[PDB]
Design a binder for this molecule. Structure first.
Ligand SMILES: Nc1nc2c(ncn2[C@@H]2O[C@H](COP(=O)(O)OP(=O)(O)O)[C@@H](O)[C@H]2O)c(=O)[nH]1
Length: 164
């Protein structure tokens, strides 16, 4: 619950909940099936990438909500991609269109989750293209954001941003 931890470029600190991890055979969007440890349970985290911070709520293979501050657009984009991956959202696994390696050249074992993080920080349009949008909030303290990190009347599903 109280410790700052890292998932690569993502920093997290648990707020609530508990996940339990089980290996599952996951179909990724390029057709491969890869065994991945999948977390089950409601969890909520403070999160950070750079100057952008947020609160992430996830359930099994689902980003439920991500509420972030306004920041440098590169950090907003990276926090959102990292939370989409850390969430293990079904849509994120479906977004792998291209080649992805789970062994290195010397045959050593690589972590699927970390390889997915590397994949999407390099290719985020694969994740955004099919993520989905929903109407932004109206008349509130929050606004919606599109995949270009601009305020918009429709927002990436589950994501909202605190008005300055
Ligand atoms: N949802 C959730 N993810 C976690 C937790 N602890 C570690 N992780 C993530 O779980 C994944 C673990 O991947 P990996 O290190 O490859 O370990 P493996 O599943 O044992 O092969 C990483 O994406 C970690 O950030 C947790 O308590 N909850």
């Amino acid at each position: 619950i109280r410790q700052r931890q890292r998932f690569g470029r993502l920093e997290l600190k648990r707020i609530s909940g508990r996940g339990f991890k089980n290996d599952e055979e996951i179909l990724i969007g390029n057709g491969t099936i890869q065994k991945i440890g999948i977390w089950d349970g409601e969890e909520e985290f403070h999160v950070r990438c750079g100057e952008c911070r947020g609160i992430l709520k996830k359930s099994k293979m689902k980003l439920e909500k991500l509420l972030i501050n306004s920041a440098k657009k590169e950090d907003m984009r990276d926090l959102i991609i990292l939370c989409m991956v850390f969430s293990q959202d079904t849509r994120m696994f479906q977004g792998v269109r291209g080649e992805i390696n789970f062994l290195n050249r010397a045959g050593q074992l690589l972590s699927p989750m970390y390889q997915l993080q590397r994949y999407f920080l390099n290719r985020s349009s694969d994740l955004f293209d099919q993520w989905g949008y929903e109407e932004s909030p109206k008349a509130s303290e929050l606004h919606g954001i599109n995949e270009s990190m601009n305020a918009s009347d429709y927002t990436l599903k589950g994501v909202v941003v605190t008005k300055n």
